Structure formats: structure tokens, C-alpha cells
Structure 1
Amino acid sequence: VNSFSGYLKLTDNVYIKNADIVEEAKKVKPTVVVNAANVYLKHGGGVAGALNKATNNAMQVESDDYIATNGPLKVGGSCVLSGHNLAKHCLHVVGPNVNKGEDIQLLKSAYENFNQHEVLLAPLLSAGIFGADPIHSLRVCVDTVRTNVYLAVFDKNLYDKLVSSFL
């Protein structure tokens, strides 16, 4: 039993809700919140900009030190950093950005990072400003993630379309 509330169950292990991931993180304080990161951990907009804003820029400060030490992530890769006031940990996961020309096949590799964590609160990878089809992202999530994932979808219209079209 966990504290996630109001989710629709899609499969044995995947759950979905129309919710602001920032507000959901602040309420649940999950062990792991997933950020829709880029390789530079520059949290300017989309989910990343919103999560970072909620940390009063502490996420960005921590991230800049991480990059200075380790260099950029790989597309499809991830790193674990602090969750600040939102979660115990933040799993920064880089899905391919279609608006940059990145291989959409890397979306499966990106979701594989979730399997290193038993339970996660997450957005749909590569959705939103990353330019991929969210219906496809949900399909890859369900077919790749085996751990327990709670998906927060900000847009109500998109949430309804994802549920109604789910196979």
C-alpha cells in the first residue's frame, strides 16, 4: 500500500492521473520523482522548469555542480540527484527530444532507467516540449517499465485522450 490517490490503473504496474506533477510531488513526497531532463540538466521549461522552480532553483544549482564534475548525460540515460522539497530523490531521465532530431527508439532506453526504482512518480517521457506523441510514450512506458509507475499528466484533454485510446 502506498499514498498515491486518485489514479486510474492501466496495467499491473502502471497508473495514471490528470495532475500537476509539482503539486503531486509536494503532496505525496514520493521516494522518487522523475524529471524530464536534457543532457545538460538545464531545467528551463516544461516539466523540468516547473520542478526546478518549485525547488527555488536548488535543483539547478545541484545540477550545475553535477555537470561540472561528470559532464553531460547520454540521451536515454539518467542520474539520481536530490529530490529537494519535492521527493527523497529526483531521477533525471533524458528522453529523446524530437525537436532536436533525436532517435525516438531511444525512448525505450530512457524508460528502462525506471526499472532501477521500485516506485516512481513520473511524467510521460519525451512528451510536451520534447515533441513526441504522448500516446506512443505511454505505450513504450507500459511495455518497458516493470516497477510501479504513477504517471502525472498535466493537460486534462490529453489525459482523457490517453485513457480513452489505451489498449
Structure 2
Amino acid sequence: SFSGYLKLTDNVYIKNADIVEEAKKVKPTVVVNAANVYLKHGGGVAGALNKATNNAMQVESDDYIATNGPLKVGGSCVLSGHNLAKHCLHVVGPNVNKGEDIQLLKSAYENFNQHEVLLAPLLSAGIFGADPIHSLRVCVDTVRTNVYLAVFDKNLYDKLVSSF
């Protein structure tokens, strides 16, 4: 089970951890990937998760896109979790650095409500350009299922907890 998490609300927990190492240790039912609409896992959390799967996540993702076309910003798909989890929920938050609408962040977090418990990063944070404090606020105000947030950056983790 999940261990070492601080409790923020009735259903949201948080830890300063590398989500790849956390997924390998816990092997959760669902790990969330911070995806783009093309499922091109080059960098950020997506690049790190994909590298941990030895590129099997990218091979599966390219077959999914060839069949179905791109996801919508705010949308998601369920694929295999490979060696990290039973399933991977690929969720597309808006990328502010690409000029996407931050209002779609709530729609992105609504995908989490389809799963009873998830290991997840903060959506639209990091290289997606949104304020992580805002992303945590939208997460707590949207997700009703049990979410275990992994924040890689120690200094950001301390700021998120102290300003919550």
C-alpha cells in the first residue's frame, strides 16, 4: 500500500517522491501519466514513465493513436501500466507553454473520478507551464476518488504543503 503520505483532505494525499520509483515499489492499480494529445512521451513525467517501461509504453501508445487519432485536451485514455501498474491513465492537461486554455485543467482532473484510487502527478505542472499551487487547488476541488500525489521537486513539495 501507499506509505509516507501527508493527508491534505478526506481523499487527497501528497508525498515528495519520484513517481517512477513510487510506481515500481507500490505497483498501484492505476498510475496517471501527464500526456499530450499525441501520446508522444518524450520528456517530463511522460518521458520518465516511458523510459522505465523500456519504451513499451510508447509502442503501445503509437498503436493506439494509429487506430483512434489524438486525444482531446482535457481527455484521457486507459492503456497498460506495463511494469509500473496494472493500468496507466493517460491524461491531457492544458499546456500553457503551447498557449492552451487553463480552464481545461478541471476537465482533465475529472477523468480521475472514473478510478477508485490513483497514483498521480500534478497535471499541467512542470514543463506544461501552469502554477502547481493552482493545479493542486483544482485537484482537491475536482477529484472525489482517492488520489496519491507524487511531487518530484523537494522545494516545490514544501511550498505546496505550507501554502495549502
Mapped partners of 2:86, 2:155: distance in 1: 30
Unpaired runs of 5+ residues, structure 2, are: none
Mapped partners of 1:5, 1:21: distance in 2: 13
The alpha carbon displacement at 1:82 in A equals 0.1
Equivalent residue number for residue 81 of structure 2? 83
Give the number of equivalent residue pairs: 164
TM-score, L = length of structure 2? 1.00
Once the two structures are superposed, residues 79-98 of structure 1 have per-residue CA deviations (whole angstroms, 9 ceiling, x without a partner) of 00000000000000000000
Equivalent residue number for residue 39 of structure 1? 37
Identical-pair percentage? 100
- Matched residue of 2:72: which SS? coil
- Matched residue of 2:160: which SS? helix
Mapped partners of 2:86, 2:126: distance in 1: 25
Equivalent of 1:117 in 115, 118, 121 = 115
- Matched residue of 2:109: which SS? helix
Unpaired runs of 5+ residues, structure 1, are: none
Mapped partners of 1:32, 1:88: distance in 2: 6
Mapped partners of 1:103, 1:129: distance in 2: 15
The alpha carbon displacement at 1:67 in A equals 0.0
- Matched residue of 1:120: which SS? strand
Once the two structures are superposed, residues 66-107 of structure 1 have per-residue CA deviations (whole angstroms, 9 ceiling, x without a partner) of 000000000000000000000000000000000010000000
Once the two structures are superposed, residues 104-163 of structure 1 have per-residue CA deviations (whole angstroms, 9 ceiling, x without a partner) of 000000000000000000000000000000000000000000000000000000000000
- Matched residue of 2:89: which SS? strand
The alpha carbon displacement at 1:13 in A equals 0.0
The alpha carbon displacement at 1:51 in A equals 0.0
**Cα RMSD (Å):** 0.2
Equivalent residue number for residue 162 of structure 1? 160
The alpha carbon displacement at 1:64 in A equals 0.1
List structure 1 segments (4+ residues) > 2 angstroms apart after TM superposition.
none
Mapped partners of 1:126, 1:27: distance in 2: 25
